[PDB]
Amino acid sequence: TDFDNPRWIKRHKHMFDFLDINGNGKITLDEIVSKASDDICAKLEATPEQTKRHQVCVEAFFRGCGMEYGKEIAFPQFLDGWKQLATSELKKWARNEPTLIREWGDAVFDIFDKDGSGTITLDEWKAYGKISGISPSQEDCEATFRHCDLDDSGDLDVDEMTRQHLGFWYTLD
Ligand SMILES: [Ca+2]
Ligand SMILES: [Ca+2]
Ligand SMILES: [Ca+2]
C-alpha cells in the first residue's frame, strides 16, 4: 500500500548485500540465520533455550518472504516476496491477531532483560553494538537511548524496544 514507495528500494538493496555472505548476488536462508540470529545470540550470551526461540521466529519471518534452506534467490524476487508478506501481515494486525514481528519482538526482549525486571535500562541496551557492529562515542549512545524512550519513563517497554530494534522491516519513518 505504501510498500511500493520507491524510498524502500535503496534501503533493501544495502541490507540484502550485507546478508549475502559469499557475495554471489543471491541469498539463502542459511546466510540469513547466520547474520541475523547466530551472531546476536552469541554476542549477548543467551542460553540455548533462548537462542532456539529466537531462531524459530527468524525462520518464520523469512519463510513468509519466500526463503528456504539451500535455495538461492536474487534481489527482484526477494523484494516481491517481502511486499506480499507485509500486505498480509497488515491485515492480521487489523483483525486483532498476533503478528510475526510481535512474536520476534518478545524473543529479543527476553534476551536483553538480564535481571527479571520487565523493562530495558541503559546498561542492558548498551550490551549489543548493532548489526553494523562499530561503536560510536559514549555520548551519541546515551542520546540515541533518550530518543527511543518515547514517553520519559526512564526505560523501554516492548512496543518501544520493538520499534527501534525491528522497525526496519515494517516502517519507513
Ligand atoms: Ca550468497
Ligand atoms: Ca531489566
Ligand atoms: Ca519508556
What is the 3-state secondary structure of the chain?
A: CCCCCCHHHHHHHHHHHHHCCCCCCCECHHHHHHHHHHHHHHHCCCCHHHHHHHHHHHHHHHHHCCCCCCCCECHHHHHHHHHHHHHHHHHHHHCCCCCHHHHHHHHHHHHHCCCCCCCECHHHHCCCCCCCCCCCCHHHHHHHHHHHCCCCCCCECHHHHHHHHHHHHCCCC
CA of 99 to the centre of ligand 2 (A): 24
CA of 103 to the centre of ligand 1 (A): 27
Pairwise CA distance, residues 48 & 68, whole Å: 23
Q: Which CATH class is domain 1-173?
A: mainly alpha
Residue 20 marked as a ligand binder:
yes
Task: Give the angle 112-134-55 at the CA atoms, nearest 5°.
Answer: 40
CA of 44 to the centre of ligand 3 (A): 22
Residue 151 marked as a ligand binder:
yes
Question: CB of 98 within 8 A of CB of 107?
Answer: no
Pairwise CA distance, residues 33 & 105, whole Å: 16
CA of 21 to the centre of ligand 3 (A): 36
Q: Which amino acid is at 91?
A: K
Residue 37 marked as a ligand binder:
no
CB neighbour list of residue 110: distance below 8 Å, 6 or more residues apart:
50, 53
Quoted resolution (Å) = 2.2
Please report, for residues 13, 93, 100, 121, 171, the alpha-carbon distance to residue 32 in angstroms, rounded to integers and kept in the order given.
Answer: 14, 25, 16, 29, 20
Task: Return the exposure string of 74-99: e unless at least 16 CB atoms fall within 10 Å of the residue's CB, then b.
Answer: ebeebbebbeebbeebeeeeeeeeeb
Domain residues of the chain, as ranges? 1-173
